[PDB]
Amino acid sequence: AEIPKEMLRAQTNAILLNVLKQGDNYVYGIIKQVKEASNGEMELNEATLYTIFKRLEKDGIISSYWGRKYYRLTEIGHENMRLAFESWSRVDKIIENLEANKKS
Amino acid sequence: EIPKEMLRAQTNAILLNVLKQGDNYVYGIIKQVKEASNGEMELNEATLYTIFKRLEKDGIISSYWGDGGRRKYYRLTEIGHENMRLAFESWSRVDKIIENLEAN
């Protein structure tokens, strides 16, 4: 039927945060990086990126500075990405276990 | 911290995979999830009813009576299987996008 918007938001947030984890960056450079990495699939909407960056700065997961407006990942952002990845690997294991128990 | 949005998404993912393995009932789902999580993730009945009412409302699952007699079993609808498929697809696309971001 659809990919829920919450899940679209989550995918876009995940991608953007990994971009910033590689390095402080600015919007156009991120859109280029993601279009290139996506080999052209994903045209991010600049207004969408500005919106998400605004929410993240509000939540102190990223911060901004001038160079062109650059955005870098704060400590809260680094630790929260670590917790996200760890949590999700735990989830993937739970599901691997559900499969094994189903077979047994 | 782990955002509440991310907790919700993970719990949804686990539940839908439980049902993908087979039609099941609330208490049986909670037992299976406790077993797969080796005791970490012990879900609350009221939580499952909250999530199942929304999922049923959105036509991703349906319910019917089984057996004891009058056990409420829940099944994954055709739409639910499709949404799980599109989700798994889009998320694998994203993970590839990100390997590519690094490669560059």
Residues of A with CB under 8 A from a CB of B: 1-4, 6-7, 10-11, 14-15, 18-19, 22, 33-34, 36-39, 41-42, 80, 83-84, 87-88, 90-91, 94-95, 97-99, 101-102
What CA–CA distance (Å, rounded) separates B51 from B69?
Answer: 24
Cβ atoms of B65 and B75 within 8 Å: the answer is no
Distance of CA A58 to the CA centre of its chain: 16
Q: Would you kindly state where each structural domain of chain A is located, as residue ranges?
A: 5-74
Give the pairing type, strands B71-76 and B61-66: antiparallel
Chain A residues near residue B92 by CB distance under 8 angstroms: none
Annotation: CATH topology of B4-103: Arc Repressor Mutant, subunit A (1.10.10)
Neighbours of B13 (CB within 10 A): 20
Q: Residue B103's closest chain A neighbor by CA?
A: A37
Task: Please give the helix or strand (H or E) that residue B65 lies within, else none.
Answer: strand B61-66
**Angle (deg, nearest 10), helices B4-21 and B45-57:** 80
Measure in Å the smallest separation between the Cα of A85 and chain B Cα atoms.
Answer: 10
What architecture (CATH level 2) is domain A5-74?
Orthogonal Bundle (1.10)
